[PDB]
Design a protein around this ligand. Structure first.
Ligand code: NA
Ligand code: NA
Ligand code: NA
Ligand SMILES: [Zn+2]
Lengths: 866, 4
């Protein structure tokens, strides 16, 4: 299977302007009739190359004439000798029941539904399956009325009829041209939650949420988030929905989280269904963020789409930025920034040093579904955010407005978007564009000096990005580098030079650069890379006291958290080295004291305190090291937890009790208090065993909501408390019939620190709530084991690797997209010690040998073995 | 797209 390259992009030889589809639907054999109006733009001798995969062709007509000038090759139907304008009619057959890959048209339970992004439409009919070809669709669907009473596609119901033999049809029309990745079709039986939203100019939009029969009780939060999403986009971006109806369908069987199909989003039911006894605060916030995300794509993705798939970030990075701003405006900005930065430094950095490293705009791709990445999404968004940081809100909004004014109704490029921001703002973003073409994480090194004779503070900032597996050449970037300088009272010193204010966002554009500030009347404590102003590794020689001083005085709550992370980092590294030498945890009294002060500070926002009291995950810890020792990291997180539990037991308990809430509310202050309370519980679980066991069992049984129940159950597993097996058994007995709820329990099993966890995971393949046919169940058991239990996954006997090989040998054939997400842990072999690396390499070599190796895996494996 |  061969790589496509971004610099090979060329405009298509043909366009399609309109497509009329008819689906005679049936799970065994669906007959598809596609009538496209087409226009030749290239040369007469150039043929029309239509993509198609696993299609049985029935016939080809050109202006109603049966066509003899064509041939089928691998993945294509090539048609010659066409006039300039013509009508193409294709009839073909497909088989949804056989589609275990869940790409194109497939079954989810008794429903039929689609997934077309990136290149799924070509599994439905022969088409120009590329996103610079935009067409107006009309979709007629014919099906059995009893199995499929709801027949849905994009746009508005414009026709309908009854047929003989219990069949009926419905025809839909969507007036906006679209690329085919945004086609959807759903056929099934559903309960439907109906509501409306009136836009700010007065358009009444009908909202419809389709869920499986029985689940209407879990739907109102998603509807409420949808309305909140529509409203925020109006207030913040000035954007209104542009259709009459907005449908979302919740399906249980989905490779993805959710998909923005125009006017008919299809969502994984994990991002829709919530009730207080089944869903945590985190699930509610996620539903809100994901509903918003797909909604935001209506502009940033649909009204302006992507010229080609190498431009994916144009929509996903910008739309992530949007969903982050939405969550942040509605909730706690600081908590959002904090967690997004956790993801960046702990997962996206790992990617950007792995064999799969790529720029946010890739240059080379073999399987495009492999590039829906942490890089494209999260670093993508950080790149948008830097543009925002350089321009300010007002200018950023002007650039958004110019982007739409220019590109509404067409497919654009990343470079188009940058250009609009540049032209609208008059900020020069030439050098800035290098963030789109250069992979890897820059290292920004800072040295300082205070001169008391001249009252000048001097910052010497330098950058470099190391070579990555994909690129040997690197150059300096335009790094927006935000600073604040604090005096000995905790006040900000005005930034100035030669009697003029200076912007506090410094433009770090060279390999090495000095900035000098004047009238710095006291030696400053600096806050550097404020709010993570660029997605870079900061190297600065902090003292502990500088960091604790920032924990106390920094203006932005993010910086208080960040200082505390820098404070811990030094001691995480210390203690991992110690653990390798068989030594126990060492932690200075003054560090413990800094955390005691956060617990007992009565002015601190509880939401902030909770994050400072949530230790960096094993993944964030892992990025502090060149070579990763996953067992030492896991053990050091546990020991650091046990030591703060002991040092802070009385304060932990007091704060636990003080934050008790009798009423459960999905409201930001309540969530903050609850998050702090459960953070204290976590520590307490690792303290004195009998208290631990009592607190945890009691919270589990008395909880009036799943947040509090799961925090307890999870602490029981994490600390291996006596009550653990009984609580786990109870949860299963109550919840086994509910897949989404069981996902959490599978995650807990998979991430257990118990010595026999692998054996338990193998056995859970036979559990009544588990099935290899369901991507969620697979992600929750196997994915969680491999990706989120690195200690057990990297057991020295290599048992973890052999297990993953066995699961991937199945999934490579069954559902390559899922297999590909699951292989990610194995491709990080170069970060491990030689012996682990040998075993991971043999594992990869074995998968490389599979018969019918999917392209999705092939891409990753060959990069990993290079 | 949200992937996971
Ligand atoms: Na077109
Ligand atoms: Na807010
Ligand atoms: Na210095
Ligand atoms: Zn998306």
């Amino acid at each position: 299977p061969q790589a496509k390259y971004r610099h090979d992009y060329r405009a298509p030889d043909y366009q399609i302007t309109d497509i009329d589809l008819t689906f005679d639907l049936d799970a065994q054999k669906t007959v598809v009739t596609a009538v496209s109006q087409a226009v030749r733009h290239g040369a007469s001798d150039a043929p029309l190359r239509l993509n198609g995969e696993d299609l049985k062709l029935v016939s080809v007509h050109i202006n109603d004439e049966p066509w003899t000038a064509w041939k089928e090759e691998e993945g294509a139907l090539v048609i010659s000798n066409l006039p300039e304008r013509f009508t193409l009619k294709i009839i073909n057959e497909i088989s949804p029941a056989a589609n275990t890959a869940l790409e194109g048209l497939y079954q989810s339970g008794d429903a039929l539904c689609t997934q077309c992004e990136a290149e799924g439409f070509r599994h439905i009919t022969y088409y120009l399956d590329r996103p610079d070809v935009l067409a107006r669709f009309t979709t007629k669907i014919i099906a059995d009325k009893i199995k499929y009473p709801f027949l849905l596609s994009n746009g508005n119901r414009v026709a309908q009829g009854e047929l003989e033999n219990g069949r009926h049809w419905v025809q839909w029309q969507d007036p906006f041209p679209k690329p085919c990745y945004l086609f959807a079709l759903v056929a099934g039986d559903f309960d439907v939650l109906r509501d409306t939203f009136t836009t700010r100019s007065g358009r009444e939009v009908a909202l419809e949420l389709y869920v499986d029969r029985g689940n209407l009780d879990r739907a109102p939060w998603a509807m409420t988030s949808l309305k909140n999403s529509m409203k925020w986009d109006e207030e913040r971006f000035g954007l209104e929905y542009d259709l009459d109806i907005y449908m979302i369908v919740a399906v249980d069987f989905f490779n993805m989280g959710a998909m923005e199909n125009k006017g008919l989003n299809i969502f994984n039911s994990k991002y829709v269904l919530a009730r207080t006894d089944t869903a945590t605060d985190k699930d509610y916030l996620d539903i809100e963020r994901v509903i918003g995300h797909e909604y935001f794509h209506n502009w940033t993705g649909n009204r302006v789409t992507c010229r080609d798939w190498f431009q994916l970030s144009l929509k996903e990075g910008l739309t992530v930025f949007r969903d982050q701003e939405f969550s942040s405006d509605l909730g706690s900005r600081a908590v959002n920034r904090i967690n997004n930065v956790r993801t960046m430094r702990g997962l996206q950095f790992a990617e950007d040093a792995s064999p799969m490293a790529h720029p946010i705009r890739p240059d080379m791709v073999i399987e495009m579904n492999n590039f829906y990445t942490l890089t494209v999404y999260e670093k993508g968004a950080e790149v948008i955010r830097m543009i925002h940081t350089l321009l300010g809100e007002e200018n950023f909004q002007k650039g958004m407005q110019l982007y739409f004014e220019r590109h509404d109704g067409s497919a654009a490029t990343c470079d188009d978007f940058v250009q609009a921001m540049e032209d609208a703002s008059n900020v020069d973003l030439s050098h800035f564009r290098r963030w789109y073409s250069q992979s890897g994480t820059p290292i920004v090194t800072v040295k300082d000096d205070y001169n008391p004779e001249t009252e000048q503070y001097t910052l010497t900032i330098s950058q470099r990005t190391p070579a990555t597996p994909d690129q040997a050449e690197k150059q300096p970037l335009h790094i927006p580098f935000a600073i604040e300088l604090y005096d000995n009272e905790g006040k900000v010193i005005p930034l100035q030079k030669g009697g003029h204010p200076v912007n506090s966002v410094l433009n770090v554009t060279q390999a090495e650069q000095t900035f000098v500030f004047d009238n710095v009347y006291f030696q400053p404590v600096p806050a550097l890379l404020c709010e993570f102003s660029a997605p870079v590794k900061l190297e600065y020689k902090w003292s502990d006291q500088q960091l604790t001083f920032l924990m106390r005085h920094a203006r932005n709550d993010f910086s208080r958290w960040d200082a505390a992370q820098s404070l811990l980092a030094t001691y995480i590294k210390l203690n991992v080295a110690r653990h390798q030498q068989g030594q126990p945890l060492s932690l200075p009294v003054h560090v413990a004291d800094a955390f005691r002060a956060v617990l007992l500070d009565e002015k601190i926002d509880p939401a902030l305190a909770a994050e400072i009291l949530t230790l960096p995950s094993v993944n964030e810890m892992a990025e502090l090291f060149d070579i990763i020792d996953p067992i030492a990291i896991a053990e050091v997180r546990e020991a650091l937890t046990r030591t703060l539990a002991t040092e802070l037991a009385d304060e932990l308990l007091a704060i636990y009790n003080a934050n008790y809430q009798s009423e459960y509310r999905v409201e930001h202050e309540d969530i903050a208090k609850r998050t702090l309370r459960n953070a204290c519980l976590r520590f307490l679980a690792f303290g004195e065993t009998h208290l631990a066991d009592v607190l945890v069992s009691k919270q589990f049984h008395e909880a009036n909501n799943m947040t509090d129940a799961l925090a307890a159950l999870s602490a029981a597993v994490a600390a291996q408390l006596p009550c653990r097996d009984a609580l786990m058994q109870e949860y299963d007995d109550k919840w086994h019939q509910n897949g989404l709820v069981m996902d959490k329990w599978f995650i807990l099993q998979a991430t257990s620190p118990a010595a026999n966890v692998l054996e338990t995971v193998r056995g859970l393949l036979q559990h009544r709530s588990f099935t290899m046919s369901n991507p969620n169940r697979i992600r929750s058991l196997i994915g969680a084991f491999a990706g989120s239990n690195p200690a057990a996954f990297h057991a020295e006997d290599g048992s973890g690797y052999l297990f993953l090989v066995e699961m991937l040998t199945d999934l490579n054939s069954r559902n390559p997209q899922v297999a590909s997400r699951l292989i990610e842990p194995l491709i990080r072999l170069k970060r491990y010690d030689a012996k682990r690396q040998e075993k991971m390499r043999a594992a990869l070599e074995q998968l490389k040998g599979l018969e019918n190796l999917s392209g999705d895996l092939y891409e990753k494996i060959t990069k990993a073995l290079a | 797209x949200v992937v996971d």
